[PDB]
Structure formats: structure tokens, C-alpha cells
Amino acid sequence: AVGACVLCNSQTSLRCGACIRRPFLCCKCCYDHVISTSHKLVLSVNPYVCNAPGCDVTDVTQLYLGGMSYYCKSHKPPISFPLCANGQVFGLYKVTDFNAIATCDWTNAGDYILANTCTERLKLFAAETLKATEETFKLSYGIATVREVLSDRELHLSWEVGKPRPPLNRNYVFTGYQIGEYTFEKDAVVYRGTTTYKLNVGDYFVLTSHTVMPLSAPTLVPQEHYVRITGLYPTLNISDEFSSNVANYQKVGMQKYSTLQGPPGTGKSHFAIGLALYYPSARIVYTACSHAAVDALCEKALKYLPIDKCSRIIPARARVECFDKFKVNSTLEQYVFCTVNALPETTADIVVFDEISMATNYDLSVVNARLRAKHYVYIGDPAQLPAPRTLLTKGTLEPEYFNSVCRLMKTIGPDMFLGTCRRCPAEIVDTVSALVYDNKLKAHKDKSAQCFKMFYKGVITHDVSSAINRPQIGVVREFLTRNPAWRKAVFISPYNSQNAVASKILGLPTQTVDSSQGSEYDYVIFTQTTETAHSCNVNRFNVAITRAKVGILCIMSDRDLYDKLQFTSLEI
């Protein structure tokens, strides 16, 4: 119970007992909090509650100090001061934005906008409160048990009736019972158990409500501009291969932190691994939110960096399969590849945080608390997909509000920008350059002449809320008979249910737009499925079409995005 205020750091014994995170509030700030919100419980050494037997008065405005104890107006002695008077709540060592974070339910977009526009301490308070809320909301869902086993990939479950049923897709990871993490995709549902055990009739699962740990470090450390490279030792031999990034690697050694906007296939991984070849003595920790992003950095380092100084830090409880080729869990190796949630207590010359659009302010803070570094490099693209905000249902979260790093890239601009897309045919590069990069993304490849668009709204059917468009899958089928070279294509769509129908009918490997991020394929077949805000989202549209290296077929529902696609229009 000893500490400083979240709004001005003025020392106090006062905490708000109504806040889900019980923040320390000073005498003036605690008052301006209780008088403006429904939050009336004030904690300190002892809570502010009437001491008189059986008295349930807990509002600090209806309370007074009688001698050494606290009492309401019905119990107070003649010599008693009200706890609320003269803009202060009585406490030791004797704003609008804080109120809104402390009381919001996180279902509105404006709640996240504010969690990013506020001061740095209010950013941590909001990040902590939001994560606590998201975890307490996980309990609100019911417990599901095994009813029977059809085969090695199909089953049926008993639900606790009453308490809501959480959504069935590859976005909700259950913790079976201690039979490893599990995922679900739709009466015969499919079980994607991260561990191979015969799911006995009687075992049950639950959404892992991993507890929220208070935030110490800021989302972004204070910026420092240096006039010479600091604590890093460059080379004058750096291979031609990484010479396009030499002026940027120098900017990296001349700032405490630096931002890199890298559109799809502009060489983000190349930049990250090449930074190690530019400062060859530097100890570098490569971090990202997902195991897939960490693994993609593992793959690029396997080609250019010495395997003996590499290590893939894997969490004790192995969820799904990750990197196998590096010396596992060696914390003192020069190059360490580990996810934000598995980051051990250590220091580094440079920390590279890749896929920055997927990072939350909580993630930004964790990295700053578990890693003390000379240089921090954030690589990503605010034009790509952000972390799914489960509680958010009203309003769309704009890129300047994804996190503090995205916020900078969208207002002041990124420190560095990779302007040449080497992956996509010019039809795709030109489309997304106009759509999300203000015509600053350039095509390295020529037009492949294999980028097609078909405007076909079809028939939207719903598998609960996840959507299906069978006429769009049927249009893909007719196209595949006439274009057998498209037999190697990946079927992408914004919905899992669409992907499941297309997996059975077309037989193509499947992918949601969100899971396609970071990956590339020669041929991509995208069916838009619906014209919802989800399927029409420009960051999602951008990721979807920028997966193709050679050609893409887009079956569109929205006329806007269809007309924007600089592709050859097909017929039927």
C-alpha cells in the first residue's frame, strides 16, 4: 500500500477501490475521480468504510474521520472532518481522460483511441485495465466437456447451458483438462489439439485466463538522438546484399529507438538480419508477438547468421510446433529469437521488435520491462492487421491507434520506410500503393498478367456469425477447370467457415487473411465472401492481395474495392 499517483506521481496512501486495477490516486486526483465517476470506494491503510457495526456506508463523500476511525453522517462523532472537502480526499502527504479509462467496458473503439491519446502513465493504466477486463471476460464463457469421438480429427462437446458459448474458429485457444491447448473449427466439429491425446468422454477445456501483471516500463522509452553511433561497432566490409540499408543501420545506432514501415515484401526480415551483419559484435534479441513471426526471423538468420550463436527461446509449456534448428533455451547466445510472452530477464545491444502492427501497448511495455537495451528497432506496417481486440464490438480501430509505435508512424511518419516491393506483380503493388501507402510503394516486379478480379456477390450464408458464400467457391471451381496452373493456389478469405467449405469443395490449402499475414505464395485465390466492415477493411484487403508472388484471383462482393483492384476483369 505504499506508492505514487498515476496522474501526477504525488505520493499517497489512497488507491481507488472501485478501479479493476486499484491505482494510486493523490488527494486532489482521488477527489476529482470520486466526484466525477460512480467510483466511490477509496482504499489506503484501511478502506474508507463506516466502522460502526453493520453500517454499509462505503461512499467517501458520505464519510468522515472521528478520532482515528471512519464513520458516515449517521455514525460520526461531533469532532469529525468530512473525507471529501476542499478538492481533496483525506490522505497521507496532502483527469477527465483517467475517468473514462477507469470506467469504460472496452467494447467501443473510442475506448482504444483514448488508451493511445493519453499521457504515458495513462497508456499503462489503460493497457493494464484493458488486459484485466479481457481476462475477467474469459470466465464469463461456459465450460465444455467431451460427449464422443468420431475420428482422429472430428468430435462433439457438451456445453454448460446458460453461460454464453465462445466463438468457434482459430482465434480462441482453450486449455484442455491438463491435456494441452486446443482449438475448434465447425453437427461434426473439428478438434485441433496442440497435444495428441484421445480426448476421452469426460475431459473438459477452458479459455486460459493467464493473470495480468502490473505494468512498470513505458510503451516507448524516452527518445534520444545521438550525433554518432553509440555502443555498436559497424563494419566497412558489409556485403553489397545489405548495402541498401547501410544509411538506415547508421540511423539505428544514432537513436535510442527507431521505426521502420515495411509494406509487404519490401525486405523487413532482410533489414532485421542484415542489421546483425552491420554491427557484428552486437548482441541482438529478435522479438515479436507470435511464434510464426519469431520463426520467420529464425529462417532469415539461418541463411546469414552463424547457427552456433543462435538460440530459439521456447516457453516451458510447449503450445504448438516452432523452430527446431537453433540451440533451444540458451539465454546467453549472441542472437536470441523469442516471443514477447516468453522473454526472459536480460539485456542487449539492440532489440528488434518485428510485426509491430500486431503488438498491443501491454506488449510494448513488457518488452521495455524484460529487456534493457542500447537500441530498440520496431519493424512493421500500420497498413497491415492489428492484434484482434476481443472485447471491441462497436466502431473500427484505425491504424494510428494500434499501439504507440503505430501512432507515431501514422502522425509524424516512420523513421525509415522500405519503398520497393519485391514480392508482388505490379498489379498488386500498384493497387495497395494507392489504397494504403499514398502512392509511395514501388513495384520491383513487372505486371504478371495473372491478376484477375470478378465482381460476384453470390449468396451469403451464416455458420452462426462466420460467413459462407458457396456461389463464390463455385465460381473458383469453374475457374480452376479452365486454369489448371491455379491448382497450386492457396485459398484465402476473411472467414474460417468459407475456408472450410472451400477446403472440401476445391481441395486447395486454406488460410484466413489474418493467418496469411507474413506469408507468401505463388498463387492466391481470394473470395471476399460478404460486404461487411470485416471483409471490407483496407488493412485486411491489403494483406490478402499482397500474399501472391505470381498471380491472384479476387472474387469480390464490394464494388469499391473491386473497382480499386488494378487487375484484369474476368467473366461469368
Please report the DSSP string for 232-293 in residue order. Answer: ----S---GGGGGGHHHHHHHTTBSEEEEE--TTSSHHHHHHHHHHHSTT--EEEEESSHHH
Nearest to 245 by CA among 304, 314, 161, 157: 304
263 is in an annotated binding site: yes
Residue with Cβ nearer ligand JG4 (525 or 536): 536
Q: Is 65 in the site for Zn ion (CB under 5 A)?
A: no
Contact partner at residue 536 from ligand JG4, Zn ion, none, CB < 5 to 8 Å by partner kind: ligand JG4
Residue 524 in grid coordinates:
492466391
Phi, psi of 206 (to 5 degrees): -160, 140
Nearest to 542 by CA among 418, 437, 407: 437
CB of 47: closest distance to Zn ion in angstroms?
13
| SS3 assignment, position 298 | helix
Nearest to 544 by CA among 384, 309, 359: 384
Number of residues that bind Zn ion (CB under 5 A): 18
CB of 73: closest distance to Zn ion in angstroms?
8
Residue with cell 456461389: 471
Q: Is 532 in the site for ligand JG4 (CB under 6 A)?
A: yes
Residues 97-136 that bind Zn ion (CB under 5 A): 102
Q: Is 146 in the site for Zn ion (CB under 5 A)?
A: no
Q: Is 95 in the site for Zn ion (CB under 5 A)?
A: no
375 is in an annotated binding site: no
Contact partner at residue 29 from Zn ion, ligand JG4, none, CB < 5 to 8 Å by partner kind: Zn ion
Contact partner at residue 558 from ligand JG4, Zn ion, none, CB < 5 to 8 Å by partner kind: ligand JG4
CB of 545: closest distance to ligand JG4 in angstroms?
16
Residue with Cβ nearer Zn ion (121 or 270): 121
CB of 109: closest distance to ligand JG4 in angstroms?
12
Q: Which stretch binds ligand JG4 (CB under 6 A): 103-111, 332-340, 505-513, 531-539?
A: 531-539
Secondary element (H or E) of residue 80: strand 80-82
Residue with Cβ nearer ligand JG4 (266 or 528): 528
Residue with Cβ nearer Zn ion (42 or 432): 42
Nearest to 525 by CA among 552, 546, 504: 552
CB of 474: closest distance to ligand JG4 in angstroms?
23
Residues 533-562 that bind ligand JG4 (CB under 6 A): 533, 536, 558
265 is in an annotated binding site: yes
Contact partner at residue 533 from Zn ion, ligand JG4, none, CB < 5 to 8 Å by partner kind: ligand JG4
Residue with Cβ nearer ligand JG4 (420 or 461): 461
Contact partner at residue 531 from Zn ion, ligand JG4, none, CB < 5 to 8 Å by partner kind: ligand JG4
Q: Which stretch binds ligand JG4 (CB under 6 A): 132-140, 502-510, 516-524, 530-538?
A: 530-538
Q: Is 531 in the site for ligand JG4 (CB under 6 A)?
A: yes
424 is in an annotated binding site: no
Residue with Cβ nearer Zn ion (101 or 272): 101
Residue 472 in grid coordinates:
463464390
Residue 555 in grid coordinates:
472474387
Contact partner at residue 424 from Zn ion, ligand JG4, none, CB < 5 to 8 Å by partner kind: none
From candidates 15, 21, 40, 75, binder to Zn ion by CB under 5 A: 75
Contact partner at residue 18 from ligand JG4, Zn ion, none, CB < 5 to 8 Å by partner kind: Zn ion
C-beta neighbour count of 470 within 10 angstroms: 15
264 is in an annotated binding site: yes
What are the CA-CA distances from residue 126 to residues 9, 18, 132, 223 (Å)?
16, 15, 10, 22
Q: How far apart are the first and last CA of the chain?
A: 70
CA angle (22, 10, 51) in 5-degree steps: 50
Residue with Cβ nearer ligand JG4 (297 or 561): 561
Helices of type H across 37-108: 96-103
Q: Is 16 in the site for Zn ion (CB under 5 A)?
A: yes
- Long-range contacts at 489-492 (CB < 8 A, ≥ 24 apart): 489/521, 489/522, 489/523, 489/524, 489/525, 489/553, 490/516, 490/521, 490/523, 490/524, 490/525, 490/547, 491/525, 491/526, 491/527, 492/516, 492/524, 492/525, 492/526, 492/544, 492/547
CA angle (61, 67, 73) in 5-degree steps: 35
SS3 string of 327-339?
Answer: CCCCCCCCEEEEE
Nearest to 405 by CA among 353, 369, 441: 353
Nearest to 83 by CA among 56, 57, 51, 61: 61
Could you tell me which residues are beta bridge partners of residue 261? 380, 417
Instruction: Sort 158 into a burial class: Cβ within 10 Å, 0-12 / 13-18 / 19+.
Output: middle
198 is in an annotated binding site: no
Nearest to 378 by CA among 260, 471, 488, 461: 260
Q: Show the binding pattern over residues 250-289: x = contacts ligand JG4 (CB under 6 A), - = does not.
A: ----------------------------------------
Residue 552 in grid coordinates:
491472384
Residues 312, 324: Cα–Cα separation, whole Å: 8
Residue with Cβ nearer ligand JG4 (112 or 362): 112
Residue with Cβ nearer ligand JG4 (129 or 530): 530
Number of residues that bind ligand JG4 (CB under 6 A): 5
Contact partner at residue 59 from Zn ion, ligand JG4, none, CB < 5 to 8 Å by partner kind: none
CB of 126: closest distance to Zn ion in angstroms?
13
26 is in an annotated binding site: yes
Mark the binding-site residues, compressed into ranges: 5, 8, 16, 19, 26, 29, 33, 39, 50, 55, 72, 75, 262-269
Mark the binding-site residues for Zn(2+), compressed into ranges: 5, 8, 16, 19, 26, 29, 33, 39, 50, 55, 72, 75
Residues near Zn ion (CB under 5 A) are 5, 7-8, 10, 16, 18-19, 26, 29, 39, 50, 52, 55, 57, 72, 74-75, 102
Residues near ligand JG4 (CB under 6 A) are 531-533, 536, 558
Mark the binding-site residues for a ribonucleoside 5'-triphosphate, compressed into ranges: 262-269
